[PDB]
Structures are given as C-alpha cells and as structure tokens.
Amino acid sequence: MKMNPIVELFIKDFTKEVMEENAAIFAGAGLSMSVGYVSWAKLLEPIAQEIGLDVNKENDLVSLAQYYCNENQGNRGRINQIILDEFSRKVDLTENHKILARLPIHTYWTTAYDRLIEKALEEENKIADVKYTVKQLATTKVKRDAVVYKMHGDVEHPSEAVLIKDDYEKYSIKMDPYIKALSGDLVSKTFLFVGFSFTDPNLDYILSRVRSAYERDQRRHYCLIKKEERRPDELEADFEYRVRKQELFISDLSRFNIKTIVLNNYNEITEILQRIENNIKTKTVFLSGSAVEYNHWETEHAEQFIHQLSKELIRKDFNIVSGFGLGVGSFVINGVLEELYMTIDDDRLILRPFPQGKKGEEQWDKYRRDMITRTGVSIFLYGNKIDKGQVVKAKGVQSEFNISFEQNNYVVPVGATGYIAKDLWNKVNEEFETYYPGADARMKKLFGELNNEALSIEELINTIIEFVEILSN
Amino acid sequence: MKMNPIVELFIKDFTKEVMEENAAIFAGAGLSMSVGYVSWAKLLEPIAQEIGLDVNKENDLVSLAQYYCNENQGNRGRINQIILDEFSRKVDLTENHKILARLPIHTYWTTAYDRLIEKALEEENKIADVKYTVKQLATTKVKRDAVVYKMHGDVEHPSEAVLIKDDYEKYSIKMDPYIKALSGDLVSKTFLFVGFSFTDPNLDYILSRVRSAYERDQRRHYCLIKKEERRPDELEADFEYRVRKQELFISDLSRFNIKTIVLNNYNEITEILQRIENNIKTKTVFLSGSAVEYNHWETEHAEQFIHQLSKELIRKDFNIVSGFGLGVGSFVINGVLEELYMTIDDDRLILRPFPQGKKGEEQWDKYRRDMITRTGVSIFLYGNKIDKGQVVKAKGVQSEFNISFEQNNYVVPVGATGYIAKDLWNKVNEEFETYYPGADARMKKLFGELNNEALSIEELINTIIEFVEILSN
Amino acid sequence: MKMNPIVELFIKDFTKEVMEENAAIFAGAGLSMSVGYVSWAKLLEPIAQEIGLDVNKENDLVSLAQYYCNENQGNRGRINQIILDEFSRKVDLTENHKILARLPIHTYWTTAYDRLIEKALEEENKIADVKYTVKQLATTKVKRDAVVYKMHGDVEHPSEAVLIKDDYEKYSIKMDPYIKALSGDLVSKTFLFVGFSFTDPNLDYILSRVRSAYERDQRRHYCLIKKEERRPDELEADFEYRVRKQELFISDLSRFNIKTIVLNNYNEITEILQRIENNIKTKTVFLSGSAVEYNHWETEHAEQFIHQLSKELIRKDFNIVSGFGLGVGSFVINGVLEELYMTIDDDRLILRPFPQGKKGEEQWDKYRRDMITRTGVSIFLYGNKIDKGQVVKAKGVQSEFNISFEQNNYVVPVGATGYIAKDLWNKVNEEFETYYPGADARMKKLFGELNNEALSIEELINTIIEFVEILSN
Numbered sequence A, B, C: 001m002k003m004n005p006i007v008e009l010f011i012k013d014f015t016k017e018v019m020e021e022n023a024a025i026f027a028g029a030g031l032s033m034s035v036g037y038v039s040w041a042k043l044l045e046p047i048a049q050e051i052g053l054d055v056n057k058e059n060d061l062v063s064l065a066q067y068y069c070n071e072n073q074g075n076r077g078r079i080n081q082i083i084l085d086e087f088s089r090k091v092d093l094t095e096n097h098k099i100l101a102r103l104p105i106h107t108y109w110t111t112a113y114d115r116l117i118e119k120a121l122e123e124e125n126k127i128a129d130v131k132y133t134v135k136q137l138a139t140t141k142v143k144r145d146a147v148v149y150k151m152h153g154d155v156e157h158p159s160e161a162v163l164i165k166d167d168y169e170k171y172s173i174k175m176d177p178y179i180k181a182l183s184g185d186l187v188s189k190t191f192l193f194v195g196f197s198f199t200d201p202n203l204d205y206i207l208s209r210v211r212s213a214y215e216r217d218q219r220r221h222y223c224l225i226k227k228e229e230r231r232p233d234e235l236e237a238d239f240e241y242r243v244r245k246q247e248l249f250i251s252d253l254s255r256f257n258i259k260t261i262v263l264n265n266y267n268e269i270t271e272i273l274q275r276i277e278n279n280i281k282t283k284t285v286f287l288s289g290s291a292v293e294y295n296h297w298e299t300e301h302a303e304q305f306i307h308q309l310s311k312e313l314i315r316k317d318f319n320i321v322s323g324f325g326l327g328v329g330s331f332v333i334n335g336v337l338e339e340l341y342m343t344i345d346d347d348r349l350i351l352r353p354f355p356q357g358k359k360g361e362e363q364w365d366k367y368r369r370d371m372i373t374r375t376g377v378s379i380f381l382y383g384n385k386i387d388k389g390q391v392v393k394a395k396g397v398q399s400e401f402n403i404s405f406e407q408n409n410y411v412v413p414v415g416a417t418g419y420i421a422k423d424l425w426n427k428v429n430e431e432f433e434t435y436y437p438g439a440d441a442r443m444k445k446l447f448g449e450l451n452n453e454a455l456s457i458e459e460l461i462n463t464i465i466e467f468v469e470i471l472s473n
C-alpha cells in the first residue's frame, strides 16, 4: 500500500536527490541498535555502578564516562575494553544496511563504532573507503563507490573513540578536518539523518556553525524520528508532556532546516527505504520480445506500436535496456533515437545484442542475467521466432520472464501482442497475488486491459505507461 | 552471604576475565606470610644488629642488606644462608594457594622465593613451569598448565635472589628479559595483585615504563590491600593520619590504572577467592535423571519440559554435562542442539553415555565420578527405570546425588518430577542447613516451589533457572 | 608421495609444535606476492624514475623511498597513495592463507600491509585480532582465535606504514612495544618464517638482540627459502656464485638458530602446509558402525575386537569421536576408558549420542555432519541394525561414509566385519584412485588385508592401526 502524504513527499524528494548522487546518509547509533548490539547505557551500567552511580537515574552518559575516568586518574582502559568487546561482535546485518548499500549513495557519516556499514557495502561488491583518522582524509581509495566518515572513531581503535567529555572538548582541535568536511557536506549534499537523536555536542556545534554561516539559506536536510509511544505503566498527562516535548524538539530541529519525518514504528524505516529503492530500481525497464509475426496487427502497424511505446517510455524519463531481439529491438532503437534526437546518454538506451554463434550461446545465459539485473521492470511483447521454416514460440522470452521473476522484478506481459506474451499474461493472471502482491482495483483493471486485443496502438501504449507508472510510484 | 558492592563488581569482572584465560596473578611476599614464614624484617633482625642498626627503627630493608654487604666487602654468605634456611622449610599450604591452583589461571608472577605456588599447582596435578632464570625463558615445558615467573629468584638459588640494593640496581641489565616479559603481560593480561605492597623498585620502574608507553590507555588491573587498623596503643590522630596516607597511596596506585579493593581482614582474601572459584565452578551443571514414567505429566509434555529446561540452561551461558540417561538424555541433547544451532563447542554440551554390558558396569562408578567432578551444580529429574517389567526407582540417580554431595556440589532435586527426585527433595528439605548453609528467604521459597506439582512447564523452568542463578551468583 | 628427509623432519617437528599451540607464523611480503599484488620494486618504479633513479639498478628500495622523500622536503603523499591503491585491491586468497587459517595457530607476525591473513582467518569463522598500533596492544579481543601483529603497518593507514629509512630509524622508539612483543615471542614460541627474505633492518636488530641476550640457548625457529634457480640468460659461473652466496646466507641465518628448509619450488610451500595440516587433521578418527550381528565372530569375540581396537587407537595418541552407535559405541567407550584409566580429557574421547525420537531425527543430519567434521579419518565396522524383526543393513553407516567422503576424509572400511562395511570396502576397492590417490604397494596390501576374514583379532587390529598410521604420516 502507501503511507502518509508527508512521507510520500519525502520519498519523492529523496529519490530525486539520490538519483543525482547528491544525497548522503548520517547514521547514528540507533541504526545499529536493531542489529543486536546492547545500548550504550547498558554498556555503561557496570561502569556507573563502579563509581557509585546508576545509569537508569542518569541522563548524560558522556558525563558518566567522564566521572569514571576522573576516578581512575584519567584512565580509559575499562571503557576501551568494553567498547572493543561489545562492538566487535559477529552479528548479522539488518535490512536497512543492505538497502543503503544497494542505493547509489556515495557518502556516509556515522557516529557508531561498529563496522556494519562497511560490511553492508562490501557485501554488495562495492568498494567502500572508511575514514576515521585525520591522516586518512588525505588519501582516497581508487574507484571507491562510497566513503564512510566515522566521525567518532572505529571499534578496532577504542582509544580514539569519542566516549568521554574530554574527547568532545578536544574534538574541535584534534579532529578539526572532520568538522570542516562535515560542514562542507552539510551545505553541498542533502542528508538523511537515520537513527540519530540530535543530542551529540559535536553535531550541535557543527549545525550551529552552519546556521550562523548561512542563516536562512541553509540546504534542506531530512530526518527520521519515531514518535513517542506510551510506556506500559505511565499516566496520560506525562505521555502528553513527552509528546509535546518531542514536538518542540522536532520544531527546533527545523531551525537548522532539517525536516523531520515522524515514524510510527521503527520498522517503518525499512518500508521507507524499500520505497526509495523501488522508485530508483524500477526507473529502468527491460523491453523483452522477438517477433516474426505480429498477431492481429500488420507488420508496419506493430512496428509503429513498438516505436511509439519506446518513444513514450523514454519521454517519461525511463531507461530502456534491450537485448536487440529480432523484431522489437530495431524498433525500440528507432523510438529511442527519435525521442532523444528531438548524442545518446549511456543511461537512457542500453543495447546488449546477443552474440550469434555456438561460442556465444554458452555465455547467453549469464549475458541475459546481466542485462536483466540492470533493470527493475520487465515488459514482454510477442515472443515468436522462425524455426524450421515455421513460426515457433521463442523460449528466450520465457527465459527472460523467469530470470526477471527470480529477481523480484515487476513483470508486465503485454497479452495483446499475443504468442508467448499471451501465455505469460495468462500465467500471471492465474495467480495474481504471486506476481503483484497487494494490488488495487486500478492495477487489476490495467492488467486485464493488457489483454484487450480490441485496443488501438495509442490506447494500449497508454495502458502500459500507466501500469509502469503506478508500479514505479 | 555477600560483601560490599565494590567487591562484588570486582568478583564479576575477574570471573569474566579468568573464564577467558586472560587473567594473571601477581603474588607478593604477603601471600606467603600467612603460611608460617617469618617476615623479612625478622629475618634481617640479626643482620641489622650485626652492623649496629635495628630493623624496628629502619624502614628500608633493602638498604639495610646493602649496608650489611658493604661492611663485609660485598659478601652475601650470611644473607644467602638465612634465606635458604628460612624459605626452604616444610610448611603446609594455605587455602589461597590451593584455590589459585584450582582456578584456570595460566600465568603467575611472584616476588617470593618460596615454592608454595609450585607446590599448590603440583598438588592439583597441574603441570607448572617455574621460570626464575634468563635462560629458562627460551624453553617452554610441554603441555604446561601454568607458568610461574619468579622475578626475584628461587630459594634453592640464594645467590641469585634479589635482596640487596646492588641486585635492584643491576636488575635492569641482568634480568632485562623478565622486565620485558612483565611489561608484555601488564598490557596483554589482567592482573590481580594479591599480597603485594607496591613498594618494590622493580615494579615501580616497570609500571612507570608501562604508563609512559601507554598513558591513559593502560589495561585495568586489580589489587587487594587490607585497610589500616588501629594498633593496640596508638592515638586516634595518628591512626587517621595512617588511614589518610593509605588512601593517598591507593589513589596513586590507580595512576597506573590499578584498581585497589579495600579488604577489612586478611581472611577476606580467601572469601573473595572462594567466590571467584564458585562463580566458575558452578557455571557447569549436571542434568541427572532417568525416566520411563513421567509422573503427573504425559510423556510428550515432560519431554517438552526437559527440552525447554536444557534450552534455557544453554541460553543462560551454562554448560550441560549429561550421562545420556534413559528418558532425559535425548531430550537434553535436543534442547541443547536447538539452542546452539539457532557446530557444537566441546564446553557447552558434554555427553558421557554409559557403556552397556557387564564389562562397563565395573567402570561405571569411576565414570560417574569423572562426569560429576567436571560440574559444579547437580539438577535431578525423575529417576525411575524399568526393571523386572515394573517401574522401579533408579538407584543411579541416588548414586549421582551422593557423589555430588561428597564433592560439595550444589544439589537441586526437582521434586515436581517425582519418584526418586521427590525423595531427594524431601531429604534435602529435612536438613536444609546441611545442603544449603546460610540460605535466604528467596532461596527457601524457590526450593519449596521445586515441589509445587501444580506449576506449569514454564513456571517450573523459571523456578529452576532462578535457583541456579542465585546459586552461581 | 613424500619429500626430502629434511623436509619430513621439519614437518614432524612443526606438527608437534602446532598441536601444542606453541607455534607462530612470521609471514613476509613474499607470501602475498603469489596472490597477485605487484612487487614493491614495481610499485617504486615510477617513484625512482621521478628522482632520476631506476629500480632495476637499485638494490635498496628503502633508501630509494628515502631519497624520494628527501627530494619532496620529507613528504610521503605519493608513497602513501601508491601503497593504498595497490595493497587495498580485491584479490582472491591463495591456498597458503586458507591452510594457515585452518591450522591451530594463535599468533601471526606480518611485515605485509595487505589484509589477506585477516581475511583468511575470518573466512574460517575464526575471531582474529589484528594489531598494528601501539595502543591496540593494551586491548585484547574477547575469545580471539589468533592475533595478527602487523609490525610494519596496515594498508588502510598508509601514513603509518614502514616504507622509508626514517621510519626504520624511528621504529626503535615509536614502535618499541612491538619490538618487545616480538622479542618475547621469538623466545617463547617456535616460528615458521614463510615468504621472508631476512633483509629487514628491524628483524635484523630484533634477532641480534635476542642472540645477544640468549647466546647459544636460543629457541629453534624454522624458515622456508626457495633455492636459487638459473635465470634464462646467465653464465654457469654466476649462477654458482649466487648459489654459494645463498648457502652462506642460509648458514648465517642459523647463527640465530633459525633452521632453513631449502624449497625447490614456491608451490612446495603449499605441499608442506598441506602435509602439516594432514598430520593434524588425521590425528582424529571417527569410529563408525552399528551391530546386532557380528558376522563370523561371536558377540563376545567381536566385542573384544572393538574394545581392543579402541584401546590400541587411544594408545597410539589418536582421538576417537564416536556417535555411540548401537553395538560398537559401548565397546569403544570401554576400550578408551580401560586405556585412559590405566579423568577423561575432552580431546581423547568425544561422545555424541544420537537423540532418540522424531524430534531429534530432524537434526540427526546436521549432528552427524558436525561429528564427522571434527575428524580426519573414518573407520567403519559392520553396519547392520535390527528392523521389523530382521537384521537389515543400517543406512546410517552409509550416510556417514558419504559425509566423510564429501569432506575428503580418509575412509577405512573394515571389510572383515561384514555387512554394509563389506559393501563399503568393495565400493572403495572398485575405484581405488578415487578414494586413495597415489597409493603405494604397502597401502594396497593393507587395504586388501582389511577384507581378509581369516585374520584373528590381533592381526586385524594391527592391519587397521598400520593403515591409519601410514595415512597420518
């Protein structure tokens, strides 16, 4: 289904930002607390007991750690050992980290010591450049896909982690290049603050400096904060007081032009990220098909149909990936060229002709999987081919359909074209929840109109375009 | 009972360190002064009289011995003879040495010339590798269980013992490998300084070097020092001055990140060590039982009970040792596997099936004693077996109970299961101080709830788990 | 087959050292040059060209880098960028790294900046603690399986890497704790220097210090160096001069008691490591079988046979892992107990009784795979079981055989026992190269004697023992 209109507007804006590679993610400690790591308060629980305090009655953990260091003549051995033993455990990644790794985001700023972001980026075969030291800023990893600025330290270097109040006090001098880099990113990139509480003194100082430098012309940043929920045993008045206090905090965040999105549940973050990826993943379509006969239409009429379909798809800011199949590939190229020339960007039209010969047939399967992996939505037209002097049904269209379905791609079999596409349409229609879960009345009507053979070229193309649009957004 | 919260926190931390085999013991001369050896001042009393001085009016015994050597043109014959005659006597070990030998500690550093630590380690059938010479460091005894670095010399080699000031002055050159080894251990292992005064120049030099090398990132070490007590004839003001001076000394110790635990009595050291061993000894439980009938519950319900009990025990970081008894062993295995697979560590589940046949029955007794010796807590379920076509009471459960009781293991007879376990529960209940000395109201309530047959599976399992928890800690 | 007697003696000694966890690996840059990284000379080739020099005509690359830094007023930007871009590439691990990760080795010392060792250790699900900074020495990762001391720096921190001569000059002051740690390890552990040239000034200084401290009582260390091979265009006399110079260098290495093993090829390193692992992997046997009938022998005679076989296996320092199968498990336990009691070590006898019940049968497969994974050699006896009132063939023995074969374990089906073991023996005999590649005449004779049903108990046990011995070594 869908979400609140505010969340939908945020999704549209951030998908617009990400596709231009001008988006950054600021991940706090809260993004990793769902993985399985104990909260920092629970880590400091024995430490507070040692100096005679209690974490449950303490609001400032930084001052708690500073008191612990003061008792031990400024020694951090126990704190370093605690953070090293806790944040270096072997835990499975959450879905949020994998989604963020799949997104085309080239900048991560983290206040968490764990390497979950690095691991998520490396699992997706993405070269990630982690920077948590001043000297590391002067060297850039070659062909990096994303840079993770760990602005508070790494788990493998506990002595450098910003935990106590002296660390924050000397941060402005020791880690000044990181402050300058974050100040530059907060004005040159659009941030999405996920799992961040906005209570960090370093972030307060940096944001205040940015606001003082730019006043009302600050760049718009987005934030995700869960609304306060009533505790199991609490009066109504205190819950309303907490909600009022959270509303004031959210309004105060927008002083730095950081728009806050209220989230009912923590699991809504994953649903937002999935939507953001889907609006990007489905932006590329895969025009599958091959035809020597064109069913009810004549060859010229169907060629015009395919040409105009590709022209409309390109006109609506879609990316066409075509295998240059016999009978549809040339007309797809013609439509794309007619729309574009009214040079060719490598992102608009992607041609992958299949090598002809017994040597290329062995690599055909991986070639086809590589093609389909580039796309998010698959559209199937006709699907017959001439074999043994007869118009047989082309099994490559079925193979593409199977590969796209294995990849959880949205399949749109145009049944009006006929042949193997009609069979695909019937197969999808028999079990509609399997291929299109949670569909609406409009989606079902459009799908049932895909097999309406009495439609003209324009009506069928409009049906397909509306179907792809409601799929993408 | 219990002790101060500071001591309890130290006990928890050090038990955590020992179970990971990252703990070391630094034993000074004070740990042996309880055995029966005369103090070093009393040994030097005739020597001081010889050169015209008096030990009671002298604070530095090292300089006293150096003066004695200076008078005799640098000859140490009398001092060597004195230390050889005093520290080679035949004395009985204290409880502290035996407890330290029973603990899983692989490193001992000693400034005492006596071989009490070696003897304690050898009494427990532990291969101990004593090192007091530079050449001995290059050779490691095969399959050693603990290495004792006698950093000041052995009693059987009085000429090499560090007694006079020239020995300390040339220690940095002669015994440099020992200094390097102690510097490595002070940063790679957690030390417990027992019976040490922290006035040794070698230790001061080594600790200062470690602090200069690591500054505030030094590893946390623990110390045990008795609080100053008022002498029989002393003013209040001088006693308060001594206490203030001791507090300043304790605070100065933490400059090297050595946390000091204030002990009211010397005998509290034994009570701390017993607690440290008990938190380790009781970490392993022995699930005893055998069932062909399952009392009030059905066979499936009781199988689920045993399965979930084992799953909860493993989930709470306990080690299950099972004799694979008929009716409980398979379900214990099922629970352990379900918890672990959500490979098998050799420490989590230990299976010792009893060999069936007249040849194995003769070794059954030693086999059972070996099994129970591995554990610290014994839990008994049901205990009937099919014999002569009838459900007789199984005497093996009673034998296990007797063996565990002979070993001072905590016995937890689950009386709700019934049969021989109900008899065991009644036997423990009749004389409760015999099996559970110094019990509290909560422990008595939990024990009386073990026979509450109206409890469900979850309630009974929670009762058993809480009982085992309050036993372990 | 086998190798030179010197290499065999080294293999025996080092396998003896590794099994006692007293062995360490010192890996130089040469161990990674087979992975695909370009040599350090090729990295410095543009740098030398920049300052007017040439690497091919230069023997000291450290001085070359120092000259490059001197030209640029002591700036290392280009060198840091070069090492970061080269040693952070994504390359596949070699077999040597995987073998070293599988070995029970708890200490690695590396002069290579790449993280290949860390990756190899993490692929085997081993917790590895990488240390390349002074502060990192004071913190130990909990439950680490191996510690990798990167004594020259990490690739992700190029500014700290020891590349130029100033770095070596200030190493003795900056990285002094690493020098002390390596000095301690060079006297407390047996090292295997793989892929190291022994031209590093730091290693020369450390080894000279160790020799000066211990003189002729230094611990024995092992090294692997490839013999010099004639270049494609070179005179005989210069090749003989190079060989003489290498022999002198090898002899000079033994001054520090570092025995050097001459290797004809680089690929002989993998063959040595495979032998070292095989002598450790095959030290544990898996006694598979289940019997209600005992073929030609009577029940008592076959029970004595199994008992004595287990007793002999334990007597020859083997580890027995038994699934407590019906008919062989009890007698295996009896034999092991009789041999050991003449406590039970967790490594000598490992019992894994199979949970009986429909709940445990679902986990039986993973349980059996976990059991067999612990072992290196599988021995199969009988293999029948009572089903439907008849002595059917037990399929669990066949399943174990299949699992062991999938794991490349040596299978020893005792065909004299009969039943499913005779079928296993015939199956192995039909295609002998598949299960025992590169066998000798003695191995074939022993295998053909395993089915000699006329053998007595002692003769059959001796045959099995000799077979397992020639397999292990």
Ligand SMILES: Nc1ncnc2c1ncn2[C@@H]1O[C@@H]2COP(=O)(O)OP(=O)(O)OC[C@H]3O[C@@H](O[C@H]2[C@H]1O)[C@H](O)[C@@H]3O
Pocket: A287, A288, A289, A290, A322, A323, A324, A325, A326, A327, A353, A354, A356, A384, A385, A394, A395, A396, A397, A400
């Ligand atoms: N002389 C040719 N010149 C150029 N291209 C040719 C020729 N001859 C055949 N082709 C095309 O090769 C592909 C593999 O051949 P195929 O296995 O027979 O394909 P198919 O079963 O018709 O599947 C159809 C899908 O495959 C791909 O185009 C097909 C053919 O149209 C597309 O992705 C389609 O959408």
Ligand SMILES: Nc1ncnc2c1ncn2[C@@H]1O[C@@H]2COP(=O)(O)OP(=O)(O)OC[C@H]3O[C@@H](O[C@H]2[C@H]1O)[C@H](O)[C@@H]3O
Pocket: B287, B288, B289, B290, B322, B323, B324, B325, B326, B327, B353, B354, B356, B384, B385, B394, B395, B396, B397, B400
């Ligand atoms: N065919 C069998 N297969 C497997 N195992 C069997 C069989 N037949 C009997 N057993 C078990 O042998 C042990 C010795 O036998 P037992 O002397 O008769 O034992 P018990 O009196 O019931 O004591 C119970 C305690 O002993 C041990 O399990 C018992 C039996 O359950 C445990 O530690 C119990 O906790």
Ligand SMILES: Nc1ncnc2c1ncn2[C@@H]1O[C@@H]2COP(=O)(O)OP(=O)(O)OC[C@H]3O[C@@H](O[C@H]2[C@H]1O)[C@H](O)[C@@H]3O
Pocket: C287, C288, C289, C290, C322, C323, C324, C325, C326, C327, C353, C354, C356, C384, C385, C394, C395, C396, C397, C400
């Ligand atoms: N009352 C029982 N008490 C104890 N143990 C029992 C009983 N009843 C059966 N067992 C054993 O369970 C295992 C699984 O049963 P199974 O699948 O029938 O085994 P199998 O086909 O005979 O394979 C044989 C191999 O499996 C394992 O022992 C077998 C049985 O002997 C070993 O590893 C063998 O080497």
